Amino acid sequence: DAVHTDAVQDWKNGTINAQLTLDLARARMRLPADRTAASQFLRYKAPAQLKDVYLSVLVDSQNRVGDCLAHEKIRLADITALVDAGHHAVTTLSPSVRSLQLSHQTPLTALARLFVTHETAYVSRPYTGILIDARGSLPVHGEYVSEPLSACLFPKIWSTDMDLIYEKNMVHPDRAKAWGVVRYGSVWDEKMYRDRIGTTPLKIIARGVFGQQRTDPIIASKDAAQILARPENLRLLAEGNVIILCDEAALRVHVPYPLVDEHFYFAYHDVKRFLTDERSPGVGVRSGINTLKITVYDVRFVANSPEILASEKDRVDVIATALKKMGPYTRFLIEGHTADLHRPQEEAALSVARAQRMAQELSRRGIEMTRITTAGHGATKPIAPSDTHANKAKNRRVEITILRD
Ligand SMILES: [Cl-]
Ligand SMILES: [Cl-]
Ligand SMILES: [Cl-]
Ligand SMILES: [Cl-]
Ligand SMILES: [Cl-]
């Protein structure tokens, strides 16, 4: 609490960077008398905070390292092996007075190599590499929205026919461990990336993106065909001669406050298994880097509705239980939406009413109202056209964001 962590996932340079700062004034310490005790205390605090940063790294289209831990795909000791900062000094280079700082960097390949377990790779013009331009907003496969690509340790490349073109297991494992399956780049670097993709790369535009976490570029079949056409080009996949260009927001992911530990990921795993077992219709869950969002589709009730249907009583029961599984030290943002009724005034009020009713229903199930904030967005944030019943039902929803408090 006297110790604060700032951290950035630098996908462009392939490193996770952290700065841990000790506020001496807050910790009741003074320089130079307490330099050693203060420095040792910062070194004492650093391992757990660094561990939490590393859990936040996106591994693939669905999971972060913390999720993989929860699924027992990796061991906590493999992560803590990476948080030794004894090669770094405790300095006064902090921008704040009466502060000490400890900086630590870990290559992203150190995390990636924990997931490389395969033995051998599985398997026009000749090219020296593959350059995917995945900048901008990309249509999301299987959805109506368009979103930018997120970087991760193990992206996949799909064709528009959803043939799998590139995957971790296609890479020689030694090479996967040495320099990952891709490098992410910026158009502003004005680099050839000759090291990665040589002088004559195959330049390809991303036509879409796949994944819960929007990680997998989708490329035109004609472009996929070029890759698969020659041994020379197929060897590019085996060697990992692949660059993905993306936007700057994706290239530097700032790790938000506060940091969540392994227990957040364990609790989310429980929530997911719970919802999967309850099979509550039209309830989905997704995580951000330190939030969870439960989305309840086809919510029709409002603040002035009669006592809600039995079937809805059961669903809100399931939601309430799921929310509670994330523990007592959270708060909730409940946001209502409507389908496009061509009635903006009504949509505005209705979306607020929907969120209000959800909040009231949850507070009769043990979630104190002081923990809840409500908002309504009318039809202004659609996730589908409002043409069919099914698509209108998708828009008509309440999103519950679980936040640290
Ligand atoms: Cl001081
Ligand atoms: Cl030192
Ligand atoms: Cl996915
Ligand atoms: Cl509606
Ligand atoms: Cl209106």
Author numbering: 63 to 185, 195 to 476
What does the primary publication say about this deposited structure?
Treponema pallidum subspecies pallidum (hereafter T. pallidum) is a medically important spirochete bacterium and the causative agent of syphilis, a chronic, multistage systemic disease transmitted sexually, through direct contact with an infectious lesion, or in utero. The T. pallidum protein Tp0624 is annotated as belonging to the OmpA-OmpF porin (OOP) family. The C-terminal region of Tp0624 is predicted to adopt an OmpA domain architecture, but it is unclear what role a canonical peptidoglycan binding domain might possess in an organism that contains an unusual form of peptidoglycan and has a divergent cell envelope ultrastructure. Treponema pallidum transcriptomic and proteomic studies have shown that Tp0624 is expressed during infection, yet its precise biological role is unknown.
Further complicating the functional prediction of Tp0624 is the observation that the N-terminal two thirds of the protein does not show significant sequence homology to any functionally- or structurally-characterized protein. The presence of an OmpA-like domain suggests a potential role for Tp0624 in peptidoglycan coordination and cell envelope stabilization, which could be facilitated by the uncharacterized N-terminal region. To gain insight into the function of Tp0624, we first determined its three-dimensional structure, which revealed a trimodular architecture incorporating a highly divergent OmpA-like domain and a previously uncharacterized tandem domain with intriguing implications for peptidoglycan coordination. Moreover, compared to conventional Gram-negative bacteria, T. pallidum has an inherently fragile cell envelope composed of a chemically distinct peptidoglycan layer that is thinner and more spatially separated from the outer membrane, as well as periplasmic flagella (endoflagella) that are located between the outer membrane and the peptidoglycan layer. These ultrastructural differences suggest that treponemes such as T. pallidum may harbor divergent molecular strategies for linking the peptidoglycan layer with the inner and outer membranes to stabilize the bacterial cell envelope. Collectively, these data provide insight into how the unusual cell envelope structure may be stabilized in the human pathogen T. pallidum.
